[PDB]
Paper text:
The mitochondrial calcium uniporter is a highly selective multi-subunit Ca2+ channel of the inner mitochondrial membrane that serves as the major conduit for uptake of Ca2+ by mitochondria and controls ATP production in response to cytosolic Ca2+ signals. The protein MCU constitutes the pore of the uniporter through which Ca2+ ions flow and EMRE, a small transmembrane protein that associates with MCU, is necessary for Ca2+ uptake in metazoan organisms. At the ~100 nM resting level of [Ca2+]cytosol, MICU1-MICU2 and MICU1-MICU3 heterodimers prevent ion conduction through the channel, and they permit it when Ca2+ levels rise.
The structure reveals a substantial conformational change upon Ca2+ binding that makes the heterodimer more compact and markedly more bent between MICU1 and MICU2. Ca2+ binding also induces a rotation of the UID relative to MICU1. Superimposing the Ca2+-bound MICU1-MICU2 structure on the UID in the resting holocomplex reveals that the Ca2+-induced conformational changes in the heterodimer would place hydrophilic regions of MICU2 within the membrane, which would be highly unfavorable thermodynamically (middle). Rather than inserting into the membrane, we hypothesize that the bending motion of MICU1-MICU2 acts like a lever against the membrane to pry MICU1 from the mouth of the pore when [Ca2+]IMS is elevated. The conformational changes would dislodge the UID from the blocking conformation, which would allow Ca2+ ions to permeate though the channel while [Ca2+]IMS remains elevated.
Numbering used by the authors:
A (entry chain J): 85 to 119, 125 to 211, 231 to 394
B (entry chain I): 110 to 137, 144 to 157, 189 to 252, 275 to 442
The structure:
């Protein structure tokens, strides 16, 4: 039913096809539920807007409202939003079928669109960026990887800034709220009790720490298959064990502030050392 | 009835009961001769269980280690080896292994095979991966030759039997289609060992195949033979023959639409990995 979300948020109209402006894609990924016309001037707008916005991590924010996002670009971005980095490469290989280390326009454009159409019946910005103004250039691995990482970093920045009330630093209370919303387990008042009684009015959480925790959250299955050793032996996990475990199983090095906060929040037994039931049996949602 | 009993305790009972059920020799603690290990799941030179058939026998730490070596993919086994390495030098010693063995329990065979006779050796990543590879290969070879092959080829009914036995789900519809696998191939060109081993190698990497197949999952599309072969060759580095995917599509395609959906094939073989 992704087509329903898309046709709901989409804004521009051309012969029964509904295109999104980028500021609609940002809303679609940020806001869960919230609250037309297209003309050739809008077409020229989207044709021109690609040059104004840089290819950095702030691509979509600088674009603004001058853009076009087809349905397949929307589904592809959704796919590439939750890619564990180990998968990056393989995704490229699934588009590059001839194996020339490059994605031709007809290599993917025909492919994703054609499987869309086939499951149905039975010049947009991202394309203008991946294949130049005339739709003839080629894509390589380094630009694809930089774009994936920039998109993920941009969504992470927007999450952090939405939850920190526009300020440069979250407070540990606000990150606790973010974590509780994320594990969709705010119902249990025990976590609110813990954050009220142990997380004082103190240290903040900068941008990089939140970004590191996010990158850890996407690699959660590797972490589960790393800790299955302790799980099959029914062993609680101290702080140093957990820090080295994330550092090894996901490559990301978690700060001591974020781990202190998590240990303070999810400590039901009050032992200063987490266990499988209290952390992974809960984050199975993610 | 007692065979069904031991099958079910193999299915869900604890390995504490299973090892203590199939072990035969006790010490001071109980030990199992490697033959009990080939029995717990189901040797001339070159076989694995002869190089491990030398003294002594298999402890409970060695049993659990073998079962978690068989049931783990490759790129997770690399992270497991990195976990073993406490000091972070890049080469695992006997001490870290002894620590995690103690954690497991809460011997000669395994530790003298790995770290040498005097245990003074140090492991690396290549020997670990090669050990896992040889284990899985020579488990599969016995599983295969167990079916009474002829000219080194098994018929497709028995290959379907292998597939559904591995899948861990048995339903009357699926068993009926397994029986129909004989009707579908009236002549039959057999299944060699290479194709079977290749397909099971594909099945071991299924949790990554699923990640590479995310656009098809979200778009709602299904899996035909060509895309299955492409994702196999790209993710698992296997060359799925036309006949193995032929039999898989003849078996797991309940609705006969000609193509497998996510819930038909990938979900089953992924949750089997648990
Ligand atoms: Ca190409
Ligand atoms: Ca605890
Ligand atoms: Ca070491
Ligand atoms: Ca089907």
């Amino acid at each position: 039913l992704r087509k329903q979300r898309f046709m709901q948020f989409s804004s521009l109209e051309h012969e029964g096809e509904y295109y999104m402006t980028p500021r609609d894609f940002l809303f679609s990924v940020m806001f869960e539920q919230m609250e037309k016309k297209l003309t050739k001037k809008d077409i020229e707008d989207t044709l021109s807007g690609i040059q104004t916005a840089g290819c950095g991590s702030t691509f979509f924010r600088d674009l603004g409202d001058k853009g076009l996002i087809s349905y397949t670009e929307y589904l592809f971005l959704l796919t590439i939003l939750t890619k564990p980095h180990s998968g990056f490469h393989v995704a490229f290989k699934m588009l590059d079928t001839d194996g020339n280390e490059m994605i031709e326009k007809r290599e993917f454009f025909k492919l994703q669109k054609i499987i869309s159409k086939q499951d149905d019946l039975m010049n947009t910005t991202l394309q203008m960026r991946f294949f130049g103004k005339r739709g003839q250039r080629k894509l390589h691995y380094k630009e694809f990887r930089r774009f994936m990482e920039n998109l993920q970093t941009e969504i992470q920045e927007m999450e952090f800034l939405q939850f920190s009330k526009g300020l440069s630093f979250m407070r540990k209370e606000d990150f606790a709220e973010w974590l509780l919303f994320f594990t969709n387990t705010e119902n249990k008042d025990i976590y609110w009790k813990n954050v009220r009684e142990k997380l004082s009015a103190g240290e903040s959480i900068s941008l990089d720490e939140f970004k590191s925790f996010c990158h850890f959250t996407t690699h959660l299955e590797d972490f589960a298959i790393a800790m299955q050793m302790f799980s099959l032996a029914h062993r609680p996990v101290r702080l140093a064990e957990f820090k080295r475990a994330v550092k090894v199983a996901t490559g990301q090095e978690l700060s001591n502030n974020i781990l202190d906060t998590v240990f303070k929040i999810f400590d039901l037994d009050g032992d200063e050392c987490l266990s499988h039931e209290e952390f992974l049996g809960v984050l199975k949602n993610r | 009835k007692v065979m069904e009993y031991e099958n079910r305790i193999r299915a869900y009972s604890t390995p504490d009961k299973i090892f203590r059920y199939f072990a035969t020799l006790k010490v001071i603690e109980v030990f199992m001769t490697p033959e009990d290990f080939v029995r717990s799941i189901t040797a001339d030179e070159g076989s694995i269980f002869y190089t491990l058939g030398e003294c002594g026998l298999i402890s409970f730490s060695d049993y659990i280690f073998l079962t978690t070596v068989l049931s783990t993919p490759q790129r997770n086994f690399e992270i497991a080896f990195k976990m073993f390495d406490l000091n972070g030098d890049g080469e695992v010693d006997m001490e870290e292994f002894e620590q995690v063995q103690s954690i497991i329990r809460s011997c000669s065979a395994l530790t003298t095979y790995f770290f040498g006779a005097d245990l003074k050796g140090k492991l690396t990543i290549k020997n670990f991966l090669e050990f896992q590879r040889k284990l899985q290969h020579d488990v599969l070879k016995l599983e295969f030759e167990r079916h009474d092959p002829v000219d080194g080829r098994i018929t497709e009914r028995q290959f379907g039997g292998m597939l559904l036995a591995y899948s861990g789900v048995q339903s009357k519809k699926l068993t009926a289609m397994q029986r129909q696998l004989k009707k579908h191939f009236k002549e039959g060109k057999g299944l060699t060992f290479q194709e079977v081993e290749n397909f099971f190698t594909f099945l071991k990497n299924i949790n990554d195949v699923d990640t590479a197949l995310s656009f098809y999952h979200m778009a709602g599309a299904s899996l035909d033979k060509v895309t299955m072969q492409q994702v196999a060759r790209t993710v698992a580095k296997v060359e799925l023959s036309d006949h193995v995917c032929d039999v898989v599509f003849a078996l797991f395609d309940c609705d006969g639409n000609g193509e497998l959906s996510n819930k038909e094939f990938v979900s089953i073989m992924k949750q089997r990995l648990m």
